[PDB]
Amino acid sequence: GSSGSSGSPEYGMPSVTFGSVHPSDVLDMPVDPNEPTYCLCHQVSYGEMIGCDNPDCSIEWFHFACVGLTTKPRGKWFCPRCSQESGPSSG
Ligand SMILES: [Zn+2]
Ligand SMILES: [Zn+2]
């Protein structure tokens, strides 16, 4: 019979470097629908708003056509999710 063996080392080290900056330019265009949503309906928070008087309320922001608010009470208006009051007549 017979047999044998062998071997060989190995190594390496790459190298790369670069970098560049680009200027800014606000093209002539109006706003975009890419706005955040607050109201429960998850729709763009527009002017029509009242804000929940409750400071704890995370949303504390809704519309009028979602909670029936003819106008902005700018007073003591609590969202229909916080009030959760209990009585004879529900609503
Ligand atoms: Zn809404
Ligand atoms: Zn609330």
Side-chain angles (χ1 to χ4, degrees):
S2 63
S3 79
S5 78
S6 193
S8 197
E10 61 270 281
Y11 206 84
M13 196 177 78
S15 189
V16 178
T17 301
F18 51 78
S20 199
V21 297
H22 314 277
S24 305
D25 283 303
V26 178
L27 279 157
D28 202 24
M29 275 209 131
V31 301
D32 330 298
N34 278 261
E35 293 162 35
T37 61
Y38 290 73
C39 194
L40 326 94
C41 63
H42 282 282
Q43 292 319 303
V44 288
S45 66
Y46 29 89
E48 303 83 84
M49 294 193 108
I50 64 289
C52 189
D53 182 61
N54 190 31
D56 181 276
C57 208
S58 168
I59 307 167
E60 65 193 297
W61 281 110
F62 319 96
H63 305 119
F64 304 171
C66 288
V67 297
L69 271 164
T70 299
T71 187
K72 196 176 175 178
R74 60 158 158 85
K76 280 273 286 284
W77 184 94
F78 275 69
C79 75
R81 278 208 188 174
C82 288
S83 186
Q84 310 276 347
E85 67 69 54
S86 292
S89 290
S90 207

